[PDB]
Design a binder for this molecule. Structure first.
Ligand code: OCD
Length: 221
């Protein structure tokens, strides 16, 4: 990997932006959730501070490589998912909101960061390994809530899944090519995501059988 060829910097500027916008949208989303579940607003506000901290770390990984992040691509990358969260939030569909942010985006984020790490430069390797440390040193707030609320949330979780997984698989298809310039094999991303997300869904209470039915519902569309 030439960390400064135009190929690379070009790929990095979208990927860095995706990560930066990703953390920004998490921060706002967890703040917004703090409103919808004021019972748990203390944890959620702490989660949001944390995401906002990672925003700064990932901002520095661009600058170190002399890359301006392409924020408009990243904002347009997130757009449908952001939409479904907004709509689901605007109507108090907290179950849907939590699937999106606490399970889906999170599996995807963690898997990506983990697949990036072996192939990242020294500075960004450090920053990402810390983000990962933190982003699973604190516990998956949204997952424990969905597990404790499972019987009630079960049917909405299935609807949320079909609508939202579908999109996240569209999202990986669009940056596969860019991720590969960063040394990230599309397959490794798919596996890690699928494992994390499958095991999050089983943990909150679906059978294996049910999880598979759910993951397949994502493929198409
Ligand atoms: C410094 C650049 C780090 C590169 C990581 C590779 C990212 C691959 C593309 C998909 C990433 C989706 C990130 C979403 C992060 C926001 C959610 C955080 O909890």
């Amino acid at each position: 990997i030439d960390y400064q060829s135009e190929t690379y910097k070009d790929a990095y500027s979208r990927i860095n932006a995706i990560v930066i916008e990703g953390e920004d949208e998490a921060a706002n989303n967890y703040v917004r959730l703090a409103e919808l579940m004021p019972e748990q607003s203390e944890e959620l506000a702490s989660l949001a501070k944390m995401e906002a901290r990672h925003k700064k770390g990932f901002t520095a990984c661009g600058k170190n490589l002399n890359v301006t992040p392409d924020m408009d691509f990243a904002k347009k990358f997130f757009s449908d998912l952001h939409g479904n969260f907004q709509v689901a939030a605007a109507a108090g569909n907290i179950v849907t909101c939590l699937l999106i942010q606490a399970l889906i985006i999170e599996a995807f984020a963690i898997s990506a960061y983990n697949v990036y790490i072996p192939h990242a430069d020294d500075f960004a390797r450090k920053i990402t390994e810390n983000v990962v440390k933190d982003e699973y040193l604190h516990l998956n707030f949204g997952e424990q809530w969905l597990k404790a609320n499972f019987e009630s949330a079960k049917d909405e979780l299935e609807r949320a899944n079909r609508e939202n997984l579908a999109i996240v698989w569209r999202m990986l298809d669009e940056v596969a090519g860019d991720a590969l310039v960063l040394g990230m094999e599309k397959e490794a991303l798919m596996e890690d995501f699928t494992i994390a997300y499958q095991e999050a869904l089983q943990n909150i209470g679906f059978s294996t059988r049910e999880t598979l039915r759910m993951l397949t519902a994502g493929l198409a569309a």
